[PDB]
RNA sequence: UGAAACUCAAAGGAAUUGACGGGGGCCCGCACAAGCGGUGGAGCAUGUGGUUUAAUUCGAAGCAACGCGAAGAACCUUACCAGGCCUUGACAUGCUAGGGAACCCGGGUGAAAGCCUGGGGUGCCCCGCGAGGGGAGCCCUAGCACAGGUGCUGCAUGGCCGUCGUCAGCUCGUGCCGUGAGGUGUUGGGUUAAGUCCCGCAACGAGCGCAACCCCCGCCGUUAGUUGCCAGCGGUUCGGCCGGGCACUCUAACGGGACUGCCCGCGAAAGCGGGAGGAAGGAGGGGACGACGUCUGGUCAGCAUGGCCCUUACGGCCUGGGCGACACACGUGCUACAAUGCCCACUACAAAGCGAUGCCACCCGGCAACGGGGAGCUAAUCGCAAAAAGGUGGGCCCAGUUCGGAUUGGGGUCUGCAACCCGACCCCAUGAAGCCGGAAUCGCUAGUAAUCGCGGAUCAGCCAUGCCGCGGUGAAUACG
């Protein structure tokens with residue numbers, strides 16, 4: 083869920099990138 | 106006896122500064 | 123935390139007050155306003171009077187207080203609980 | 206407190222801006238200061254002429270201020286010499302070539318900003334407020350207007366309890382956009398505070 | 412704490428982080444637009460006046 | 472039968488305009504009913520009460536205070552506290568006396584501010600082969616007039632706003648009725664979203680309101696044709712890329728179009744029911760617009776302003792602290808408790824905006840935040856930019872779990888003079904409560920509710936889960 087920075091869902095929410103939602 | 110609210114015990118005056 | 127590419131931060135004006143003591147045989151009770159300064163391994167064994175906004179708290183430094191800022195060792199609010 | 210500014214409400218319809226120009230994001234604001242500072246000087250210095258509308262045009266590195274004064278005898282002065290000492294005073298703020306026209310007033314009794322100042326001075330000069338409002342609204346309607354409304358608010362007569370006084374004649378449809386309502390405001394200082402004076406002239410529709 | 416802070420905004424400061432917008436009309440330190448150099452109040456005052464080029468009460 | 476002491480400034484009659492009724496009649500509003508999602512429980516974000524504090528600056532208080540002033544509190548802001556400092560002062564006008572400057576680069580002390588400082592060298596009109604001495608942008612030293620105050624009074628005020636309420640209402644002129652307050656008109660039958668409009672009438676008109684003129688959206692036209700478009704032929708490294716073209720789509724300016732105009736049916740008429748044409752039908756959907764007034768409503772801290780108050784300080788500069796406290800209570804929210812779901816890979820479809828110490832293509836280093844290089848764009852051209860729900864494929868198998876993502880340990884990144892108090896983000900580890908929420912209670916009648924993502928203001932960065940917008944998908948129900 084969106085509170086989970088450690089997934090693609092959380093990253094879209096906080097609008098950032100990383101290992102779990104690269105660009 | 107000085108500035109603004111709360112009052113310092115003199116009419117009009119408060120505690121600040 | 124600060125970019126380690128940049129410099130480990132001390133205000134410079136406090137660090138010179140130290141190195142002189144080290145030199146001409148420390149230690150006086152050193153007072154400052156640089157809460158933001160990092161505890162630097164030179165500082166160990168001195169006591170530094172850090173302002174808490176109100177007073178200068180005496181802080182004796184030890185090998186294991188090194189990673190931190192001086193402000194970590196002089197808290198700013200006095201609490202002691204409700205009741 | 207409810208009603209919207211009658212002029213602000215009809216920009217693009219019955220009313221034109223008082224500054225006309227384009228400027229990019231990078232210095233719209235800088236211009237804006239000069240403008241406000243400009244009218245600062247003129248509403249300051251040319252109050253005694255009875256000022257009514259400072260129209261500031263811009264093209265590039267120059268300016269054209271148009272002053273709408275009731276008695277242009279005070280503006281131009283003894284032989285193009287007053288209007289000069291100010292066209293010179295304006296350069297000291299503008300920097301640019303400050304080109305300054307003086308435009309005649311149609312009928313001063315049809316300038317809402319004028320009426321306001323005439324009433325504000327009468328209340329500044331200790332005259333009966335209610336009377337001054339009924340008189341002002343008379344002079345407008347006689348000058349062939351289609352409606353007029355004047356509103357005084359404050360410590361009228363020095364009364365401790367502040368009050369609203371007004372008077373209205375003809376018709377004033379502030380909800381109608383094709384109506385042409387000249388609006389003006391004057392402020393009136395006294396020994397006991399300040400009073401606001403709003404004057405509404407209805408000049409006919411389109 | 413007003414006039415001394417209208418002045419102190421203009422000063423150029425020890426660090427650039429200490430630079431803040433103030434309204435050039437009234438001096439408000441809050442809700443200031445960089446486009447105009449005006450606060451949200453003054454903005455609305457000069458707007459309704461027409462003294463604001465090409466500004467117009469939107470509605471849609 | 473029938474007093475007085477004492478006490479009060481009234482006690483009363485009728486009638487008027489209001490307000491009010493657990494009086495009546497006729498109406499309306501997501502008012503209930505009908506439904507769909509939620510709040511109240513949890514963890515967290517923020518606002519507040521309270522308490523605490525050197526200070527936790529000040530304001531908002533039922534609806535209409537409580538993600539409100541605050542559309543950006545680490546310093547700044549800052550209005551508060553502690554300390555160190557300045558006293559015609561940070562700022563405006565004007566008057567003197569001295570230096571005689573101006574301004575730009577230093578140095579000592581000190582947390583800085585400040586205090587003490589060290590240099591060079593100015594026209595301006597001038598008598599100048601002369602020593603030179605005046606005067607003048609503007610600086611500085613003293614000395615006055617004055618500045619300064621986010622100190623008080625929103626119960627002295629202007630301005631602007633909230634609100635009853637987009638509710639259908641509030642009035643005036645003359646006439647008429649009444650000793651008069653007042654009444655009449657504005658009531659009454661019908662109709663409307665509406666004091667909308669029709670008929671009636673001791674009234675006849677007029678003004679503020681409603682509606683209309685303004686804006687966005689829905690069909691069509693004209694005008695345009697690049698940076699936008701690609702219908703049909705020519706090339707084509709297969710990209711509208713090039714020839715070319717402006718049909719179409721779009722963009723953005725000017726028009727048209729709906730009027731209860733037409734047919735029927737009711738009716739005195741206003742209108743009302745139904746039908747046809749038509750993109751749209753009864754105001755087409757949405758906005759902007761807020762009557763006389765109410766609340767001694769809000770705001771002296773945006774600003775303006777009368778009066779009261781401070782004057783080496785209730786003013787001004789600084790460093791630091793606080794505004795971020797936490798036995799507790801409340802509001803508005805975010806994320807969930809799972810399978811109509813969660814996860815990974817691949818693959819589709821928007822709209823509105825922002826962008827020359829800005830947006831950052833693309834290449835490389837890095838698991839990543841990010842970093843280094845590096846084209847294009849003053850932007851219908853280049854960039855932010857991938858929209859996400861969806862669709863396809865695999866994985867989980869009903870478990871406090873591959874549900875949930877708080878809390879804590881460790882390791883980094885960037886902005887910034889500086890992230891201890893007190894920043895966002897990244898990765899390893901940790902993996903709380905929560906099994907659908909007591910009494911209670913909120914929103915919405917259609918492209919709405921719900922769900923999904925995207926942008927902007929402010930801004931160095933950010934505590935935005937806020938706010939103002941944008942489109943994707945798209946219901947349920949209304950008896951009354």
Ligand SMILES: [Mg+2]
Nearest residue numbers: 110111112120
């Ligand atoms: Mg208190």
Ligand SMILES: [Mg+2]
Nearest residue numbers: 396397777778
């Ligand atoms: Mg007096």
Ligand SMILES: [Mg+2]
Nearest residue numbers: 428429430431
């Ligand atoms: Mg800032």
Ligand SMILES: [Mg+2]
Nearest residue numbers: 432440441443
């Ligand atoms: Mg600001």
Ligand SMILES: [Mg+2]
Nearest residue numbers: 483484485486
């Ligand atoms: Mg009676």
Ligand SMILES: [Mg+2]
Nearest residue numbers: 503504505506
């Ligand atoms: Mg219900």
Ligand SMILES: [Mg+2]
Nearest residue numbers: 510511803804
């Ligand atoms: Mg809640």
Ligand SMILES: [Mg+2]
Nearest residue numbers: 510511512513
């Ligand atoms: Mg809760």
Ligand SMILES: [Mg+2]
Nearest residue numbers: 519520521522
């Ligand atoms: Mg409190």
Ligand SMILES: [Mg+2]
Nearest residue numbers: 519528529530
């Ligand atoms: Mg408070």
Ligand SMILES: [Mg+2]
Nearest residue numbers: 110529530772
């Ligand atoms: Mg106050």
Ligand SMILES: [Mg+2]
Nearest residue numbers: 541543934935
């Ligand atoms: Mg914030």
Ligand SMILES: [Mg+2]
Nearest residue numbers: 544546548549
């Ligand atoms: Mg601070």
Ligand SMILES: [Mg+2]
Nearest residue numbers: 625767768769
């Ligand atoms: Mg009031």
Ligand SMILES: [Mg+2]
Nearest residue numbers: 206625629770
């Ligand atoms: Mg007021």
Ligand SMILES: [Mg+2]
Nearest residue numbers: 530531625769
């Ligand atoms: Mg108050």
